[PDB]
């Protein structure tokens, strides 16, 4: 019943003391933190506490949208040699640093996921040519579904896939995705392997990655310019912003101290130094 | 420093003999045949985070002058109700000396550490033929 | 719904318990037909596009 926006426990006025009770003495061998408050050690007056923990609630701590990835696509001229650039990105929070570390404060989580799409385009070649306002399809390809090989192949029919046709210039795109995990919680860290190396099998056949569950965990997004070739080249950058809503978490873990290296927990050399120089007897 | 998440199963599961932490990170350079093991830096708690924060995990600190043992009852913790034990490890028991060992005015003191663990409320499903894993 | 180690399913096998016995003047070899079906407790989620069909150009 104690909500987030509740006033914190008050400070009780306590006077001088000379008794056989020892708030001050403990033993951190027990693993337990000694739970004291100012009054326990020094004389205090009465204080009606006003501050609340309101903002520090798990839900509020993740209430911000965050850039997960930057997908780049383009629409070149018809005569061109290179193909029209259409991107495919494996949906994961671990491509960027910020949001990841925040999510790493715990062992597991559940959250309905909100994605936002900020598209931004421009020309590239020195020319005064023209491009009419461009549209963009963002097709979510769940694991196993046919990944588009061309920018104009059958896959874009999306008879079952959930897509979003964004018209450039209008407000950023947004879609809601519930907790879609195969487990009873999303796993930030997975101490194990997908395969088991059997003895009646060759090492190769039984080998897999350390820390990985399913290579394809959530699927890929596919983004393409819908409008056809235009004599003047136009490149586009779609920025995805994720805001984890309705979030729950379990078992806290120490926050990442050294820079990330790969999708794993691994650390690169040359970054193994986080704390600076400070003399013990210097304030 | 070339291959992330590359530790092989055989090095990931060192059984009852277990493993250790190191005082320095030394990259594996033999790309002809990698050593594929964990190099768990002590101060980084072996996972890129400052040891001093290791207390967020359930724990006890055996401080010689006081106690002589550490007892940590652990419940099953995972993302699933039941999971493949062969493939995945639920818990981790890390022991690192917060204060180095010192005895008298001696140069080489030695005292042993013994771990006794007892599985509790264990349940297993899907009975089949026995798995003979390639541990070596 | 794809080949994955993490979500592997196991193995279905059929072996001769005894053997097949037939008297004289009888076809010594015959056939067995297999069927599969989900059960009342089965379900499917996260709708997606199939690969078992395509339109080339």
């Amino acid at each position, epitope marked *: 019943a104690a909500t987030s926006r509740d006033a914190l426990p008050n400070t009780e006025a306590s006077g001088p003391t000379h008794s056989k009770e020892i708030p001050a003495l403990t033993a951190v061998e027990t693993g337990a933190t000694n739970p004291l408050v100012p009054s326990d050690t020094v004389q205090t007056r009465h204080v009606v506490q006003h501050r609340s923990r309101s903002e520090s609630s798990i839900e509020s701590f993740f209430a911000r949208g965050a850039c997960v990835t930057i997908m780049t696509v383009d629409n070149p001229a018809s005569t061109t040699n290179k*193909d029209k*650039l*259409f*991107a*495919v*990105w*494996k949906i994961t929070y671990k491509d960027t640093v910020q949001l990841r570390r925040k999510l790493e404060f715990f062992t597991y989580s559940r959250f309905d996921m909100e994605l936002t799409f900020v598209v931004t385009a421009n020309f590239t070649e020195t020319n005064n040519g023209h491009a009419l306002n461009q549209v963009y399809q963002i097709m979510y390809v769940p694991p196993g579904a046919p*990944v588009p090989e061309k*920018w104009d192949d059958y896959t874009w029919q999306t008879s079952s896939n959930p897509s979003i046709f964004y018209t450039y210039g209008t407000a950023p795109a947004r879609i809601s995705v519930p907790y879609v995990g195969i487990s009873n919680a999303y796993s930030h860290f997975y101490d194990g392997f*997908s*395969k088991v190396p059997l003895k009646d099998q*060759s*090492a*190769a*056949l039984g*080998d*897999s*990655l350390y820390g*990985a569950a*399913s*290579l*394809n965990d959530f699927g*890929i997004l596919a983004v393409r310019v819908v409008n056809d070739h235009n004599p003047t080249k136009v490149t586009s950058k779609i920025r995805v912003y994720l805001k984890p809503k309705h979030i729950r978490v379990w078992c806290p873990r120490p926050p990442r101290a050294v820079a990330y290296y*790969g*999708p*794993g927990v691994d650390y690169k050399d040359g970054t193994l130094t986080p704390l600076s120089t400070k003399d013990l007897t210097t304030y | 420093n*070339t*291959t*992330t*998440m*590359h530790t092989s199963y055989q090095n990931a599961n060192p059984g009852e003999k277990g493993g250790t932490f190191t005082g320095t990170f030394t990259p594996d350079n033999n*790309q*002809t*045949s*990698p050593a*594929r093991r964990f190099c768990p830096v002590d101060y980084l708690l072996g996972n890129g985070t400052l040891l001093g924060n290791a207390f967020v995990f359930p724990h006890q600190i055996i401080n010689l002058r006081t106690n002589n043992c550490a007892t940590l009852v652990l419940p099953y913790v995972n993302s699933l109700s039941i999971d493949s034990m062969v493939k995945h490890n639920n818990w981790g028991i890390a022991i690192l000396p917060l204060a180095p060992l010192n005895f008298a005015s001696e140069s080489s003191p030695e005292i042993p550490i013994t771990l006794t663990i007892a599985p509790m409320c264990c349940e297993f499903n899907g009975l089949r033929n026995i798995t003979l894993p390639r541990l070596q | 719904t794809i*080949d*994955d*180690s993490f979500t592997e399913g196991g193995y279905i096998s059929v072996f001769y318990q005894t053997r097949i016995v037939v008297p004289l003047s009888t076809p010594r070899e015959m056939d067995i037909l297999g069927f599969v079906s989900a059960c009342n407790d089965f379900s499917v989620r996260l709708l997606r596009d199939t690969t078992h069909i395509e339109q080339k150009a």
Partner: nanobody
Amino acid sequence: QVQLQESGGGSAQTGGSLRLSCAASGFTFSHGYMAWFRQAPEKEREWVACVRTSGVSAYYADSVLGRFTISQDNAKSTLYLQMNNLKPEDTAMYYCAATSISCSSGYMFWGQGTQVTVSS
């Protein structure tokens, strides 16, 4: 648009050698593996060999052991399959399956493949 395009041909005499290459693009998130697969004329698709992300740690198929060599050049973002001692069993199509992996089986990107023929 992770474009995997094989090359290397396939029309050698029995016993020779060929260099099977594969140009990779798009976003190959290094970490994982990169490999080779063969379908054969009339058999099931079979795994040939897999090499680690950037690491030169690899394995080979029992059938091909030592007679096939799979490397990489992540500077050139390519993988190579040198094949010495080609034989009548090696006559088949080869595919550069280099994406995700994590092992020697999972994929989200294949190539168009190329045929090899060891004649004699």
